[PDB]
Design a protein around this nucleic acid. Structure first.
Ligand code: MG
Ligand code: MG
Ligand code: MG
Ligand code: MG
Ligand code: MG
Ligand code: MG
Ligand code: MG
Ligand code: MG
Ligand code: MG
Ligand code: MG
Ligand code: MG
Ligand code: MG
Ligand code: MG
Ligand code: MG
Ligand code: MG
Ligand code: MG
Ligand code: MG
Ligand code: MG
Lengths: 52, 187, 122, 52, 129, 52, 127, 147
RNA sequence: GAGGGCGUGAAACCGUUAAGAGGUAAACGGGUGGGGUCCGCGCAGUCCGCCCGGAGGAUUCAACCCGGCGGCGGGUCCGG
RNA sequence: CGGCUACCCACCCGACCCGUCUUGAAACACGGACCAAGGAGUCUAACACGUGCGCGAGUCGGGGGCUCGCACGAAAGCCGC
C-alpha cells in the first residue's frame, strides 16, 4: 500500500498544458485528425449566447 | 580478417536531438538546411549547439551578455545565444544592443524593452542573416556548475581541492582523519 | 502553422493505420493514401481532392476556398463534373495548371480521377 | 500573432452582430509532449491504488 | 490472369527453412520457434560443423523483394469498405486480404467493391454458401 | 483569466503567457523567401553512382 | 447517471441481491407490462402479476393471440406458468413451459380491494 | 516503467547481468558501512577523508536559531527596494538619500562585494563588515546600526 | 458432436485406420531424388493501358460568344 | 502443368545430450521418465550521475484553506498580507 502512486506536477506545467490544449483546440486540422465531425459545423471555437 | 585495428564504429556524436520539442525540431530542420546549403560554419556550430543537450547548454546571464559586447568591435553586432539569457541582480545599466536567443526570462525581456534593445528568435535571426553575418555566438559558464566541483582525481590525495560528498558542511562531518595532522594522517 | 499541424498530426491522430504494413492515412479529403506532407488535405491552406459522385455518375472535386480559414462550413467548395473522361481530365488539368492553386499534386489528382473513372464506367 | 474576430452564434444558428476578439490562449504555443507528460501524471493521480 | 501487376523480378530468399530450434525434436515440450541458446557447452552457439544454423543478419532478403508474395503483390489486411477504398491509389502493387472475423454478408460486399476498384484479394472464394 | 502577452492575468496572481519560440513559423515561407534563397550554393542533383 | 452513494452500480452486488432477494422483493421484480387498452383505461404502466391474471404472450417460441390464464408463479425460479402454453414430455404427459414474467403482456387483471388501493396509489403517483 | 526496465531486456541471459563466476548472492562485502577501518579503507579513505575521529568542542543543546544571520551582499543591497524608487530618489534632486532597511527584507548582516554605484544610500542593519562599511563610506553613504 | 464432475476439450499416453520405412539404438544439419495430401491455373487459346491509319451505328459538348454562380491572382490599398 | 513447404522415405557428407561449477565436459562430474499450469531482479526511502520538461536568482505547495450537496470528483481549479 506504500507504493508511490500519486505524482505531483508543477503548477506552471499544469497551466502550460491547459494553455497548449486550449490552443490546439482552435485549429480545425488537429480536431479533425482527432476525429470530431466538423463538416457542416460553423466557425471554430463556437461562441453561443447567454440564453443557452 | 582485414582490419587488425580495433572496431570503434561510431565516434562520439549525437546526430538527432533527443528532445522531442516540436519547435526545437523545426529549428533543427531550418538550421540543418542552412548549414548544408549556405557554406556557413556559423550555421554549422549553431546546428551542433541545437543538437547539444539541455544540460550542456548553460544559461547565459545578462551581465556577461553585456560585457562580451562592451569590447571594441562589437557595437553594431547582434548577440546570438543557443540557450537562455537570464536576469542579473548585479548590473544597473543595459545598452542598446540586440539579442537573438531562445527562451529569455521575463525580467530580462522587460529590462531589455525598457532599455530600448531588440530581442529576436532564431527564425528572425535566420531571415536577417542566413550565413550569420554581423553575429557573435556566445556560451555560458559550464564549469561553474555545482556538479563539476566534485569532479577530480580524488577528494584529497594531493589535497585535490574537489569537494567530497557529505550531508552537512560543518563540524563532525568528515573533518578528522586526513583533514588535520593532529588526528592520524593529513591528506 | 501548417508545419506545426503536420508535426502534431503525423503521429497520434485518428488516422495513420500502421497495421502490418506502411502508413496509410484514409484521410477523407486526399489524393494519395500515403500519409505524407506534400499530399495532405486537412492541414494546408490550399488543398485539392477528388471523390465519387453521390448519384453514381461523374466525379466531384473538392477544393479548399482559402478566402476564409477556421470556418469548415464554407472552407471546401465542391463541383460535380460529369463528362466523357477526356473533357473532365482536361478540365482538371486546366483547373490546376492555369491557376496558381496547387502546382504540386497535379499527377495525384489526375491519377486518382482517371482510376476512379475506370472503376466507375462499368 | 494577430487576434481575429469570431462571430457569436445564436440558438437558431444565425451569426449575430456581436463579435468578440480572439484571446491569446488560442494563440499560445502547442506542446503535445508536455500535454502528454502532465496528462500521464494526472492519470497516475486519478486512481484508487489497488489491492494489497 | 486476374490483374497481372507491374515489373517484379525473380524473388530469392537465400534459404527457405524457417530455422528450427536446437533439441526441439527430442522434447515435445519445446515449441519449434527459434530461441538463442546461451550455454557454455552448446555446439550450436560454438558453431560446430554438421549442426543447425543460427539466424543472423546474413539471411536478410533483398529490399526490392521484401514482403513479396509469389504472385507479385504486397499483402495488406482489410476489415471493411473504407479500409478497402484506401487501396484505390496503389492497387497495382498492393493486394487486399480480408480479416478472418469478417462474416460472409459483409465479405461479399468487400469482394464486390474490390472487383469494382480492381484490387486483388488473396481469398475471394472463402466462407461462401 | 490568462491575458495577452502585454499584460498579466488578473485572476491568477503569478502567471504569464509562455514564451513563443518561433514567431513566424511557416517553414515553407521561410525557405522560399528571397532572403534565404539569395545565399544558397546551387541545386546539386547529380547522383554519381558506382562505376564498374 | 447514478448520483446517490447508497446504491450500487456493482454487478456482483446487484446479482447477489437479485438472486437472493426475499419474496416480497421478488414480487416487485416479477412485474409485467400492460396492454394498450388497459393502460389507456387505468393510466398505469406496470403491475405485479398474480394467480388469476389473463396473459397474452409476446415473445418466445409462442407469440401472440394466446390470451390464457396463469396457474402458478414460482418466485424461486422467476417463472410464471400459463395454462394455455403446454409441452408434451416423452411419455405423453403434458407440462407447462417456463415463461419469464417480463415478456408477458397482461390483458385482464383480477379485481380486489387491495388492488383498487394499489391502482389508486399508481394513478396518484403518476399524477 | 517495467517495460523500460533493463530486467525485461535481460530475460534470456542465464546469470542475468551479474556473472556466472562471481555469484552475487546476498551481501558479499558486508552491510552498509561494514569494515570502515578493516577492509574497506581504500573506499572510506581516498573518497571520504576525515570520516573517523573527533574534531572539536561539544556544544550541548545547540540550536540553529541563535546564530541566525542571513548575509546580504552589496549586489543584493539594491533590489530590496524597487528601481523606480532609487531612480526617482537619485534623479539629481538634492542631497537626500533613500534608506534601505535590510531587517525589513529579512537579512541581518551586510557584507561587501563590488558594483556599488556613486549614488549614496543609508543602510540600517544589525551587523556590518569593515569592507562593506568602507565601500559605503567611499560611495558617500551613511552606515546606521539598528537593533 | 451438451446424456447426470454433462461448456470449450490441447500435450504426455493408448487403440484403430491410411501412407511410408526398418540390421550399425533412435533422432538432427547441408544437398537433392521419389511418393502422398493440398493449392492456383487450362492446359500445343489466354497478358494489358495509350496513340494513329481503316469499317458501321448512336449522341452532344468541345472550337467562339452571350446568360449565371463559386473560387484562384495582383493593382487603385480606391469604398470601410 | 508448377509449387517452396513443421508430411513420409531413401541416398552422400558432417554430426557424442542439454544446463552449469570449472584452466578443461559427451564424460566413468552433477540435475533431468514425459507432459500442462505456476515459478525467480519488483516496491519504498536516501544518494550520485546522465537525459527531457517548466520557471529561472530564484524555485517548489508535498501542510492547510477557499467553490454548491454531484458518477467519473480520493480528480481538478485557486490562495500570495
Ligand atoms: Mg571480413
Ligand atoms: Mg569485435
Ligand atoms: Mg567452454
Ligand atoms: Mg466487489
Ligand atoms: Mg550475455
Ligand atoms: Mg573467485
Ligand atoms: Mg561480487
Ligand atoms: Mg463437457
Ligand atoms: Mg460443447
Ligand atoms: Mg502399415
Ligand atoms: Mg570460466
Ligand atoms: Mg578440477
Ligand atoms: Mg556440459
Ligand atoms: Mg557420482
Ligand atoms: Mg545429468
Ligand atoms: Mg538423475
Ligand atoms: Mg508457464
Ligand atoms: Mg539532472
Amino acid at each position: 500500500t506504500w507504493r508511490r502512486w500519486h505524482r505531483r506536477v508543477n503548477t506552471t506545467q499544469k497551466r502550460y498544458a491547459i494553455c497548449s490544449a486550449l490552443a490546439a483546440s482552435a485549429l480545425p486540422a488537429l480536431v479533425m485528425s482527432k476525429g470530431h465531425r466538423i463538416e457542416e459545423v460553423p466557425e471554430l471555437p463556437l461562441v453561443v449566447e447567454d440564453k443557452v | 580478417g582485414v582490419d587488425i585495428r580495433h572496431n570503434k564504429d561510431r565516434k562520439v556524436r549525437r546526430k538527432e536531438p533527443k528532445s522531442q520539442d516540436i519547435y526545437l525540431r523545426l529549428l533543427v530542420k531550418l538550421y540543418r538546411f542552412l548549414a548544408r546549403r549556405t557554406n556557413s560554419t556559423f550555421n554549422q556550430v549553431v546546428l551542433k549547439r541545437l543538437f547539444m543537450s539541455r544540460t550542456n547548454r548553460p544559461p547565459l546571464s545578462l551581465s556577461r551578455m553585456i560585457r562580451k559586447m562592451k569590447l571594441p568591435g562589437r557595437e553594431n553586432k547582434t548577440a546570438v545565444v543557443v540557450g537562455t539569457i537570464t536576469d542579473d541582480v548585479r548590473v544597473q545599466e543595459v545598452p542598446k544592443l540586440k539579442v537573438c536567443a531562445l527562451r529569455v526570462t521575463s525580467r530580462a525581456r522587460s529590462r531589455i524593452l525598457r532599455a530600448g534593445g531588440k530581442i529576436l528568435t532564431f527564425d528572425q535571426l535566420a531571415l536577417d542573416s542566413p550565413k550569420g553575418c554581423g553575429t557573435v555566438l556566445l556560451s555560458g559558464p559550464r564549469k561553474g556548475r555545482e556538479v563539476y566541483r566534485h569532479f577530480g582525481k580524488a577528494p584529497g590525495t594531493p589535497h585535490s581541492h574537489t569537494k567530497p560528498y557529505v550531508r552537512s558542511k560543518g563540524r563532525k562531518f568528515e573533518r578528522a582523519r586526513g583533514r588535520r595532522a593532529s588526528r592520524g594522517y593529513k591528506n | 502553422s501548417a508545419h506545426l499541424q503536420w508535426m502534431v498530426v503525423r503521429n497520434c491522430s485518428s488516422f495513420l493505420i500502421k497495421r502490418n504494413k506502411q502508413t496509410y492515412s484514409t484521410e477523407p479529403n486526399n489524393l494519395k493514401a500515403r500519409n505524407s506532407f506534400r499530399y495532405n488535405g486537412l492541414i494546408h491552406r490550399k488543398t485539392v481532392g477528388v471523390e465519387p459522385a453521390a448519384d453514381g455518375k461523374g466525379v466531384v472535386v473538392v477544393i479548399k476556398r482559402r478566402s476564409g480559414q477556421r470556418k469548415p462550413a464554407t472552407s471546401y467548395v465542391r463541383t460535380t463534373i460529369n463528362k466523357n473522361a477526356r473533357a473532365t481530365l482536361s478540365s482538371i488539368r486546366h483547373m490546376i495548371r492555369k491557376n496558381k492553386y496547387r502546382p504540386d499534386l497535379r499527377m495525384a489528382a489526375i491519377r486518382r480521377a482517371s482510376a476512379i473513372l475506370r472503376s466507375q464506367k462499368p | 500573432c494577430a487576434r481575429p474576430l469570431i462571430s457569436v452564434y445564436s440558438e437558431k444558428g444565425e451569426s449575430s452582430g456581436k463579435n468578440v476578439t480572439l484571446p491569446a490562449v488560442f494563440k499560445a504555443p502547442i506542446r503535445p509532449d508536455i500535454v502528454n507528460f502532465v496528462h500521464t501524471n494526472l492519470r497516475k493521480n486519478n486512481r484508487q491504488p489497488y489491492a494489497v | 490472369a486476374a490483374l497481372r501487376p507491374l515489373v517484379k523480378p525473380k524473388i530469392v530468399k537465400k534459404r527457405t527453412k524457417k530455422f528450427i530450434r536446437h533439441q526441439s525434436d527430442r522434447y515435445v515440450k519445446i515449441k519449434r520457434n527459434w530461441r538463442k541458446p546461451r550455454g557454455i557447452d552448446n555446439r550450436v552457439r560454438r558453431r560446430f560443423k554438421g549442426q543447425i544454423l543460427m539466424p543472423n543478419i546474413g539471411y536478410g532478403s533483398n529490399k526490392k523483394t521484401k514482403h513479396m508474395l509469389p504472385s507479385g503483390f504486397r499483402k495488406f489486411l482489410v476489415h471493411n469498405v473504407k479500409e478497402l477504398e484506401v487501396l484505390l491509389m496503389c492497387n497495382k502493387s498492393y493486394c487486399a486480404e480480408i480479416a478472418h472475423n469478417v462474416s460472409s454478408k459483409n465479405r461479399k460486399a468487400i469482394v464486390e467493391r474490390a472487383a469494382q476498384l480492381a484490387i486483388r484479394v488473396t481469398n475471394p472464394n472463402a466462407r461462401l454458401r | 483569466l490568462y491575458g495577452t502577452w502585454r499584460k498579466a492575468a488578473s485572476l491568477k496572481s503569478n502567471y504569464n503567457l509562455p514564451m513563443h519560440k518561433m514567431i513566424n513559423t511557416d517553414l515553407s515561407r521561410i525557405l522560399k523567401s528571397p532572403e534565404i534563397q539569395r545565399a544558397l550554393r546551387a541545386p546539386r542533383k547529380k547522383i554519381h553512382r558506382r562505376v564498374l | 447517471m447514478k448520483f446517490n452513494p447508497f446504491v450500487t452500480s456493482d454487478r456482483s452486488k446487484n446479482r447477489k441481491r437479485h438472486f437472493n432477494a426475499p419474496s416480497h422483493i421478488r414480487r416487485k421484480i416479477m412485474s409485467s407490462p400492460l396492454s394498450k387498452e388497459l393502460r389507456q383505461k387505468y393510466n398505469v404502466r406496470s403491475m405485479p402479476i398474480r394467480k388469476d391474471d389473463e396473459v397474452q404472450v409476446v415473445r418466445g417460441h409462442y407469440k401472440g393471440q394466446q390470451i390464457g390464464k396463469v396457474v402458478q408463479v414460482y418466485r424461486k425460479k422467476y417463472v410464471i406458468y400459463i395454462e394455455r402454453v403446454q409441452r408434451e414430455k416423452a411419455n405423453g404427459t403434458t407440462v407447462h413451459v417456463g415463461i419469464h414474467p417480463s415478456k408477458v403482456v397482461i390483458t385482464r387483471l383480477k379485481l380486489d380491494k387491495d388492488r383498487k388501493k394499489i391502482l389508486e396509489r399508481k394513478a396518484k403517483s403518476r399524477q | 516503467p517495467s517495460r523500460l526496465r533493463k530486467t525485461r531486456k535481460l530475460r534470456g541471459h542465464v546469470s542475468h547481468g551479474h556473472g556466472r563466476i562471481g555469484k552475487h548472492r546476498k551481501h558479499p562485502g558486508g552491510r552498509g558501512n561494514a569494515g570502515g577501518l578493516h577492509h574497506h579503507r581504500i573506499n572510506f579513505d581516498k573518497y571520504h577523508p576525515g570520516y573517523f575521529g573527533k574534531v572539536g568542542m561539544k556544544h550541548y543543546h545547540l540550536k540553529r536559531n541563535q546564530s541566525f544571520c542571513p548575509t546580504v551582499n552589496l549586489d543584493k543591497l539594491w533590489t530590496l527596494v524597487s528601481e523606480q524608487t532609487r531612480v526617482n530618489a537619485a534623479k539629481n534632486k538634492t542631497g537626500a538619500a533613500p534608506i534601505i532597511d535590510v531587517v525589513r527584507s529579512g537579512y541581518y548582516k551586510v557584507l561587501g562585494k563590488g558594483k556599488l554605484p556613486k549614488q549614496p544610500v543609508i543602510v540600517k542593519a544589525k551587523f556590518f563588515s569593515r569592507r562593506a562599511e568602507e565601500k559605503i563610506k567611499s560611495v558617500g553613504g551613511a552606515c546606521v546600526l539598528v537593533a
